Write a protein that binds this ligand. Sequence first.
Ligand SMILES: [Mg+2]
Ligand SMILES: [Zn+2]
Ligand SMILES: [Zn+2]
Ligand SMILES: [Zn+2]
Lengths: 477, 49, 34, 67, 49, 44, 528, 48, 257, 115, 43
Amino acid sequence: RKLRRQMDIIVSEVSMIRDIREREIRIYTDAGRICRPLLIVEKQKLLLKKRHIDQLKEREYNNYSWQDLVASGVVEYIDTLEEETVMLAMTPDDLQEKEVAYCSTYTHCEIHPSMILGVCASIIPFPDHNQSPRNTYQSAMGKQAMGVYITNFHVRMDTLAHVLYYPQKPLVTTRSMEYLRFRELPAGINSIVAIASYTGYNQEDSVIMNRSAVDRGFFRSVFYRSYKEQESKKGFDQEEVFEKPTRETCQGMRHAIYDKLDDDGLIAPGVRVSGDDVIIGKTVTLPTKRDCSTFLRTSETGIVDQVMVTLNQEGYKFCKIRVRSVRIPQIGDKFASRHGQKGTCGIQYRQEDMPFTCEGITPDIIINPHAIPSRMTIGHLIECLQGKVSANKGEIGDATPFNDAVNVQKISNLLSDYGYHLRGNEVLYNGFTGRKITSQIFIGPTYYQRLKHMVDDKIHSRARGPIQILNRQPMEG
Amino acid sequence: FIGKIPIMLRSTYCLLNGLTDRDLCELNECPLDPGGYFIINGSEKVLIA
Amino acid sequence: EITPDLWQEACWIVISSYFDEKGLVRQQLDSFDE
Amino acid sequence: MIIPVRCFTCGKIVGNKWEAYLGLLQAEYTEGDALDALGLKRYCCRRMLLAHVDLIEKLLNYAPLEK
Amino acid sequence: RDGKLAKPRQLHNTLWGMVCPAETPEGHAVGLVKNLALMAYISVGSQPS
Amino acid sequence: MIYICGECHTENEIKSRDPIRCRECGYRIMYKKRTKRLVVFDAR
Amino acid sequence: SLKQRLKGKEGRVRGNLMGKRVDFSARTVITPDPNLSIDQVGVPRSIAANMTFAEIVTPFNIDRLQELVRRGNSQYPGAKYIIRDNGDRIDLRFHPKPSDLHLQTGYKVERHMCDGDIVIFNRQPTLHKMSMMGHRVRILPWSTFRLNLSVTTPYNADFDGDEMNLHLPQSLETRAEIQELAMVPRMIVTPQSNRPVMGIVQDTLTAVRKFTKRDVFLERGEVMNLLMFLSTWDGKVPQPAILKPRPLWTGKQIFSLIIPGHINCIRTHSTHPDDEDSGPYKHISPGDTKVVVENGELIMGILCKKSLGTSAGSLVHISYLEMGHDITRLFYSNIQTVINNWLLIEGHTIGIGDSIADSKTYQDIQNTIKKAKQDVIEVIEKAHNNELEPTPGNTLRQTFENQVNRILNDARDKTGSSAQKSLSEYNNFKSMVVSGAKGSKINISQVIAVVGQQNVEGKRIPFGFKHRTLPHFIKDDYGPESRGFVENSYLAGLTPTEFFFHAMGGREGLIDTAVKTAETGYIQRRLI
Amino acid sequence: LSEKDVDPVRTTSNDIVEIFTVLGIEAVRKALERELYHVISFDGSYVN
Amino acid sequence: PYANQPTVRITELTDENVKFIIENTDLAVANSIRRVFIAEVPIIAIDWVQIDANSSVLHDEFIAHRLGLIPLISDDIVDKLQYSRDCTCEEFCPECSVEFTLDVRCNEDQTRHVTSRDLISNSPRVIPVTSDDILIVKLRKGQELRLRAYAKKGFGKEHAKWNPTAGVAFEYDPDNALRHTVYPKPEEWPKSEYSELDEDESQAPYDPNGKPERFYYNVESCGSLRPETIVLSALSGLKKKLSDLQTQLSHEIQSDV
Amino acid sequence: MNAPPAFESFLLFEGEKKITINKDTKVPNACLFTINKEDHTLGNIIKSQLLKDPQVLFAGYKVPHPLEHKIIIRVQTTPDYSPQEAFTNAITDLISELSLLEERFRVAIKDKQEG
Amino acid sequence: FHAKNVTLGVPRLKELINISKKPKTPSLTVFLLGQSARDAERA
RNA sequence: AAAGACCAGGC
Ligand SMILES: [Mg+2]
Ligand SMILES: [Zn+2]
Ligand SMILES: [Zn+2]
Ligand SMILES: [Zn+2]
């Protein structure tokens, strides 16, 4: 252990296991072992001292980093079967000091207990207040949240690129989000969410969204679709040519328009293209001509964003065309918070119809209160309260899972200092009649994500269309 | 020459290794791109452990 | 020389140092380099 | 991306207040004091600048398609 | 994934700190596809010389 | 018919059935030089 | 091979004869529409324009069908094809076709779907016959199917990316048969369990529970506003329960108008105690519990899932068995509309305040938890010194686990009862629970007092490591904390070990859910 | 059932095949009915 | 069977805010005035956008969306201008629209902020609220943005770009005397800024005979319309809607009789 | 693709009548008003104003479906007082109220500036 | 999961439906006629 | 553009 700590002969990756009762000592140097760093505890004191933290605050232009911390014998990499013989503590300031005797032979201490979570699960604010199924659901849905997936998307030409108009970093954030680079590439917009029953259109899991906010760019996004075409020479006199076919030069012809194409059969960007419009004009010389042009997907109604032409591996002409279409959130789109609270948009009400506070605040999203009890997302309510506190305070809330220094009572006392009800409730006036709603509605900013699942891509209708060649039955898909 | 081995992006032998944010932007590559994936026929492939 | 009641800063500082040194996809890069 | 005008909830002009907010943060004020100085009282407006991330600067690093 | 054995799919105590307990797909792949924790590192291998 | 190169961003006129090589750079990727035909956008 | 073509699922027989892809079928996401009727389904205009119904031109309808043909395929209320007597197809999509627009008796014109059309509406998987019921088309804007929320229960649906099938019958015979067999009102009551599948659920149920209490008094204007949403109202305003000093109708008094005809039913509210029936006030009900409906009027009592829900002898069940399917459909729709529009006035919510108990309650819960932990420690020590006598039929470990689980369950039950007894009448968790709309008492217990013991395979958390649950615990630690009992509640937040144990329990639940799959589907298929 | 002081009337078994080999086929009908009712009504649900 | 007589007191009047109290009127009247503040008030906003060259990193419809939300000074000629639907001319004419032209190219190395000041209008009466500067897009050297836009006349029902007001605060019965909402714990609710009771007590005693009156208002303009002209135009528009309803009802009554 | 245009809440294309008067046969002296392309802004106003009339026995408004832009107003009046006359009187009442309110608000505004 | 363990739910339904030759938990309840029913010693 | 394989995902 001393050699591994000093990294003289044994690298920190190698693990040492002492099975005391079975008298075996096993040392593993093979690849594939899973391991995590852990602080070393000597007697009841950490080996992390104040000087290490002081140097790490100075990490910039000091040439002192995590590697030097490992080389000081302070942290240690421990695998699963070396974790067998170790005794860990949650936090030093709780489990190392003397108390009613439980244990005193602590050999290691965890850096922070929130490190047990993965990438997608670390974005959940207050994940310890949630039912574990809801945490799993949010971890699954976070991959589907729309946003700026990459900064150089303008140069990438890939199918199904979803980019959100105005991503926002969450009001209530976790300290792990900094290391996920989530601040620079957020997926979702903080939204004033009032958990209330308003018109019954948010019932079950559905939500009610502010139409006026939607008109202002709220949860508006772009859908980029890319089309690739390959020129090729397969037959002797058979070849692929990029060109604009005329009315009668080819044998096969579809009633779709071809006038939008340029001289090479490629539409320049800035051309609005609807369903059945031709993207690339390509013909086949049959051993007169055969038209194999590429058309739009049905009812996309987008605008050609970027057109790129190059040479493939073989040296033939290769064309990629990216078509963009702006999709305003409809009442079929799928929206989910950071707690597994998912649902579609029941209906969109304008600012006039939505309920309003004494200050004129109208919720951007209304979710049915019936979701919370059975689905067990208390962290959703706590995040809403913390966001309401932080928007007034001007700071960004800290929702690290295991803080012990952020109580719901403390957040309530913080909120009560800003002239609001300490529990987050707020009196709402009916949008239609103007009468006070007898119950006081729990309203506050909550981080919500627009999911890739949208109604325009899912709606389908069939009436005597194409049939399979073999079964003579309707096609699949 | 016995063949060509696909190169995981941003590894030691990748062309993007050791380049700063400005360098990556000059070559139209996202600085935030974590790398660690392969590019085969233009498709980004990631090996699952 | 110890860090009592200041742990919330120190632990996240060392975590910041760790993720600055390695990153999130250090496993793939290390395996491929090896 | 870029700071959106017309705060979603109410519609107050926040598209012109991003540069001033950044300056106030850069020189003296904390975030809350800067938002108060900008006159953003309702928390719907304060979350509009406070949570904003300016990816427009990152997008400007890449060379333009046409010189 | 088609196998109805539920034991391998369960969250084992050994997954603490190394594999995310919450993040896992829902469906036939529940518990069989695991995402890595933030601090987890995979041993790259070394010669035991 | 003008394409735009991906490195030097210089305008070069090439036609069908000739190869893609931007002059003075020898680059294989071009772009379409957004059209001149106007398209109307609604501000909603 | 041919055997492979014929044998398995997606083979010839199973994949192309017992089941097959069909024409005139549409599918899209569903969103709730409480303002639709029970048997109505919202259909987007594009879906209705694509799907067509063949109609035979007769002297009665030749003018209307001629107008539809004139409108063509472009305008929505039009026609797609014209079928001549010889069977050849005429397409109205390609150019006006002026010579072929003529219609004479005997032709078939394939008009677009219009309001009032009868369609099959299905959500897969189809577990029972109520999972596929005939609906009535109502064209609405945007691109989502919309159904009444009492129809949600039969399909087992929820409006979060749920996707529903729409089959349009193409013949008058099939349409009439589906109308007289599979209409949604005709499928209210189930032969499986002789109970109604459809009930008042979610917002309407909670708002009914709050609306029916004695304290609900409604002014003149509110009563007039509510009454217009009653489809079966006779236009005669009932005399208010209070005439002086000011007129004030009561929630029960207005709800009595919704009750169709003369329905007699007696139910009990969820909060109804068993002491009332034995002692006095049996017919006075000081808490206004129980339910008595006489002559189609709500005499007294507060309604909940026990009255309007899906249960044998429920008020809606009595309405169906007494009046009929059409009147019960109207009863459903009237309840939904009028109660939602009254909830527009009263309103409902959930929040932090509903999940927070009094400090005295927190102290009592903490004292109970400490006492439970002390008892568990005492039991562990007794087992250590071998005074623990094993119960017959059980080993020492078995009886020790039984005693520990008994202590922990007693603690959790006591803490839950203590938390619930502290809930004010305004608390919305209690409102949802007593209304029966959603949630349970254990939900409130886990919210406020204690999450409870976490189990894997019916046992406390196993020793994944060498006789220890996690590296943080000592070996051979059978205490509540080490073996998975969670002292904290969701409001308080779980400790990291408790968080991981809760994660393991949730993983077990998710495995069960993802398994509730192929084998039960196999049971269904084999049985039928 | 053959053992003394054991009730020959009310003594049953949950397994079905042995009842077929022992008590006949109508006894199997009744016993299978009871077993199905027990497995269904255990959760509290009711089936006609 | 006749009107009660409302009175108006105005507490605060600025270039951005108007705080007034309407007394002696029905709840529905105040609520519909508040609704018309948002929906039915006419205003001038950009609706028709044509982009000639756009080398910016924001796509065309993104820039059009940002332009349409830019408020335009509509204090005077919004009444003179006519809806394009009702206008005699096809497309757009000066009597039915206002033409805006933007022509910006970034030549210097430092990033250039394209702001509302870059919008050039044909008429001096409509200015994009610049007597800071509303940011449209940021241009790097070599990027260019040239577009032509026409501004139409519309109201909040069509699109939120035609909303003339920021958050319109409405409040009646600040001291809960009508019990339109019941506080489970009255002591933990902050008192309204219009509260008329002492700090010792929480709410006013219940008033069985009372009805909602003295509706407190706070209308915050977006700068496109002066906040007093917002209320004037709201009252005028609601009166016009009611008068049109009167005309149609009278015509129907004569036709049916 | 199914999104209705923006001008479906107020604009009337060809065919629709702004207001439609249908008698109610269930009770004497009751009428049903169907107002096309209108919302709660007018319905709540009409409902509140009608209730002030002592000769109005029933008054209210409803929106049959929010996705559609329609209002049904049901008015019942005492004998020898037609509901159409009640609606006309309510509308004229509202005209007078709004004119008077605008007049007083303009006076208050003028007083506030330099007063 | 829910000694005297008995297979219940879907596995028990499969056992009954498939007429399994060997049930997972084959049990047999016994009732007593005489004093064995009352007295624990004879039981 | 047919028929396969694989993967990811929704309920
Ligand atoms: Mg669902
Ligand atoms: Zn705002
Ligand atoms: Zn070049
Ligand atoms: Zn004009």
